[PDB]
Amino acid sequence: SRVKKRKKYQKAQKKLKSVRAVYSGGQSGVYEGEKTGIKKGLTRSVKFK
Amino acid sequence: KLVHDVQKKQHRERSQLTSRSRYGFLEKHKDYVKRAQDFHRKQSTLKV
Amino acid sequence: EMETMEFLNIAQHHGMPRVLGVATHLDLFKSQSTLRASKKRLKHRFWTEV
Amino acid sequence: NPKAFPLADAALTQQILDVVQQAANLRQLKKGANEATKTLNRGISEFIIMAADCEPIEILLHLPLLCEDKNVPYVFVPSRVALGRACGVSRPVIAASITTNDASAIKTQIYAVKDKIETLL
Amino acid sequence: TRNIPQVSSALFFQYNQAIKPPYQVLIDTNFINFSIQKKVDIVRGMMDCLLAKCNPLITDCVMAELEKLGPKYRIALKLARDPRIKRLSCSHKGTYADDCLVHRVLQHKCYIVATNDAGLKQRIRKIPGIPLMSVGGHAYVIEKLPDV
Amino acid sequence: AVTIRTRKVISNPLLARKQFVVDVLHPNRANVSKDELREKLAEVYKAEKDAVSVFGFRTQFGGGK
Amino acid sequence: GKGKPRGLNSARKLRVHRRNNRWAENNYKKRLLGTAFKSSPFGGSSHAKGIVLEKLGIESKQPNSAIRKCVRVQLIKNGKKVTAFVPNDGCLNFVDENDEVLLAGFIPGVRFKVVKVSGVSLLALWKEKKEKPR
Amino acid sequence: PRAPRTYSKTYSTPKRPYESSRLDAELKLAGEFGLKNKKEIYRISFQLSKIRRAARDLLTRDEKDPKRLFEGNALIRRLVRVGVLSEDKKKLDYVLALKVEDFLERRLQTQVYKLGLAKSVHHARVLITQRHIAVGKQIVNIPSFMVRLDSEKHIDFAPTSPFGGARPGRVARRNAARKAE
Amino acid sequence: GARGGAKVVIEPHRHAGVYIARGKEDLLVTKNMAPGESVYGEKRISVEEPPTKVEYRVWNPFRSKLAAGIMGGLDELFIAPGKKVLYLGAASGTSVSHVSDVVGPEGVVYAVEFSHRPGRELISMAKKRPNIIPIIEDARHPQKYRMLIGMVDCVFADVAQPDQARIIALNSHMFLKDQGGVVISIKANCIDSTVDAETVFAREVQKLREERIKPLEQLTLEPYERDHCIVVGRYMRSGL
Amino acid sequence: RKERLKKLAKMEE
Amino acid sequence: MNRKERKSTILETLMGDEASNKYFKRKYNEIQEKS
RNA sequence: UUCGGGUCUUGUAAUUGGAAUGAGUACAAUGUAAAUACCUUAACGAGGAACAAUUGGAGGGCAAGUCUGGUGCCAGCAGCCG
């Protein structure tokens, strides 16, 4: 059971990256830009009504 | 769920006879529904 | 052994009589711990057939 | 007013040197001004310790500038002979850096000293 | 420009890894009324339910509703004004309280919602990571709080 | 090497003896037999081996004592 | 008042009133007189012994139809005939006429299932972990 | 007959085991601390529930009450000794603020991982169960062992361990013998 | 990634004064007010336009929290060309220089700093940028520099202090226009490490409402930062 | 989507 | 980048990359075979 | 709910290394009234680490296969049987 839950948890950590942005230590090396691109027309801020 | 795994065994499809090899691939039901559907599209448009 | 299990299956299908297990050659065990484990495993396997 | 500022009192110096020794044992310590500088550039420094008796004091005055730009606490201890000894190395150390780790065994002890250094600044 | 709100970083999927003791609870108007009917003290009732210090909160919308209720609910208004209850300012025109509470939990994933309203409880249940407190039977009950 | 120590010594002239707890340190060794412990206790207490009785020895978890 | 005495010395009247009125609950009446198991499926037991009379669905065409899994059973305690379900059409082979079956609670109107045949679990037979003794 | 021996259950099943938030919390906990099953989490939750209920009852009592003083001081001292409660938070109010992770961080598995003797929590569990870890002079093979403040700095490889200065295990010397042959 | 002699396509962002450089990777870019030199060692992009050689600077989201705001998708920024901006917490020209680029020649930035050592680099950078007025003074006492600042369009606060809410309130009441913009960078550890970040973010929003500041949107700054958010509000001095 | 729809047909039914 | 590797256009640099050319040649052939 | 939308080191049905250890077996000692076991411990004891974890539940897919109905090619029931 310990090994089964270890594989379940590491799987969930992968999926969490596809649900929201996660901090992963920050910058490592020279800054090379946004690798997946910048979307000009999309906002992710939570708006107060 | 009272089924055994043996009951859910894969049944394998047969292929064209060697003597009939020059006529091409042996058509099966899943193949037929593709060309049956494609023909009906032409006939419906051709009727209109 | 195979012929012990073969008799039991013949008996199960033609009408089970009273079956009583007798274990022999238990003096050949050298350790008491291994002797008990063999008896337990042997008894419980016998309990599946009878 | 003096260049080496703030300088920790005797009581706080021992508490700081206690954390430095623990971080040395747990591989959470960067020794030397050059290594301390890199931690600031990478933003992995929890705070900086400097020696006020450095000869000359100017060879480590780039560190407070980097810290204040990055909002990293820093403090000066009176002796580099004592700082190097607590760092676990056989030579004097003029600057040391505690590396950031929220999964460390000495997390509570590190934050205790960090809170006091902010009060000092 | 299109807007898609970010998922809160306080959520590990359905688990709110931010809400930890001591708790902050948003009180609904009817929660106080049902609390009086069952003789359940708000601060003690919450401390018994969660075994922790709870910091109850009342918004301007909820306080306005309590005052509009009338003399019949005089007791509920006095309990709402206990100094241990802190107050949250509102910067929206309406005095409707159910929408006010739902917007706050959407903005911040740090509140427990205390309510008995059937309509509001379904709305809160759809929002992930929001524990839901209510008074039922003889004491308070909390649903979506794994630490209990 | 094997170390033998005695503690909580009570002189009991009602039964004409000395009673004590025995600690045996035996690093890198399974344990010490009662016979050899009796020999060494007879040596240290300056008594005949027939006058020494040892019992109730339990090895500590992890070994060595 | 509320229609009941409240005096500090009216405990006898309150007690005697409660004892008389407690017999109005059907649950209390059944519990005290030991008649709570008349409505039980098996007359107070969890399982029933039965005799396999005949298999109603053995001649139906469609496999694993609900009828194919039915068997007629005679309860041995009182002799009344009932219908029981077998887990699947494959398990129907282990059941044959004149065998003892153990029944348990479960085509509406069929409200029992067979759990043991000839003293052996059907699931054990279905999983090939035992042989039915004859 | 001989007098009865006392025993008790060390855990309890939660109120609603099937809540999605509970399952996700248990997933995160078991993964972060390398737990085997939900029963370990239930055990820790049971202990924490007892502690916090005791603190709640004591806080209900009047300050300077003899029972409050005596039992609250005992509870605070125990929690400080086991390392869960800090020295600067010696009040029952902070006892009510405790969480399961505070107790899980004191397990010997977590400490062995954090002190750097193991590369993960699972390597730490394997090291503990294989008799490689000593707390002071004592080999401890129990992963759920709760480390005290004083015991923290005494965790090391055991003298009998191949990693602690003894000879290599069977595998190493078997390989060496075959290589020499 | 974006190496030295690589070629990129420069197009405008949704925000005025902000640009995107396309390629295999994308970069956030602002036009250089002082061409020919970098402020903190960032990469620069040269374009030949009719021919004069215009320059651009790369905005690094890991160094600037405002850039981390742009990447995360902020809806409204009051920092735009032709606006006066009060920048509280201008350690050096790392992020003020980029804000100076966005406001442009016609706008100005009032860069307030307290510590003297970072202040020296702020003053040195401001000489190259005539639109930056460096104010080496404590933001807790806005009265000390009231002579130096006029009325301002937007207040940007990056002060990493426990009582930052008071500082933002004091400066807005004197210098910010009615319906003016407020942009706060909040770091939860600085204000209260004892509680979780979500509790801190909620508390700071409550203090802003107490100060006649209406919040409009909130954004958290992962993956660039941890336990950081930017709150954007409007200063409604008449009523909320 | 096709696999998804065939499952929506189930929950609708 | 080295001076010789630099090119006026983005595409001309992409042709220079040998790893890219090898992948495109392999991927292109597979698609044409399927076509 | 359709309309689609969000996000980025992920996947492998791929190869490969020598370290660890006790279930068990066992000199021995310890233990015991005598034993057995535990705690110790020489020598043995892992790659399918075949030294072969279980018990319930949900959902597919397949044939020159079978049964049933019918506004052709479908639907239903099902499929250890071609």
Ligand SMILES: Nc1nc2c(ncn2[C@@H]2O[C@H](COP(=O)(O)OP(=O)(O)OP(=O)(O)O)[C@@H](O)[C@H]2O)c(=O)[nH]1
């Ligand atoms: N050591 C030991 N020897 C046994 C035991 N039971 C039988 N034997 C020996 O095994 C041998 C066979 O005994 P039998 O009585 O002839 O057994 P059997 O089943 O009749 O053998 P067959 O008739 O030849 O098939 C004899 O030498 C017995 O002494 C036992 O429990 N222990």
Ligand SMILES: [Mg+2]
């Ligand atoms: Mg059994």
Ligand SMILES: [Mg+2]
């Ligand atoms: Mg050993």
Ligand SMILES: [Zn+2]
């Ligand atoms: Zn409101």
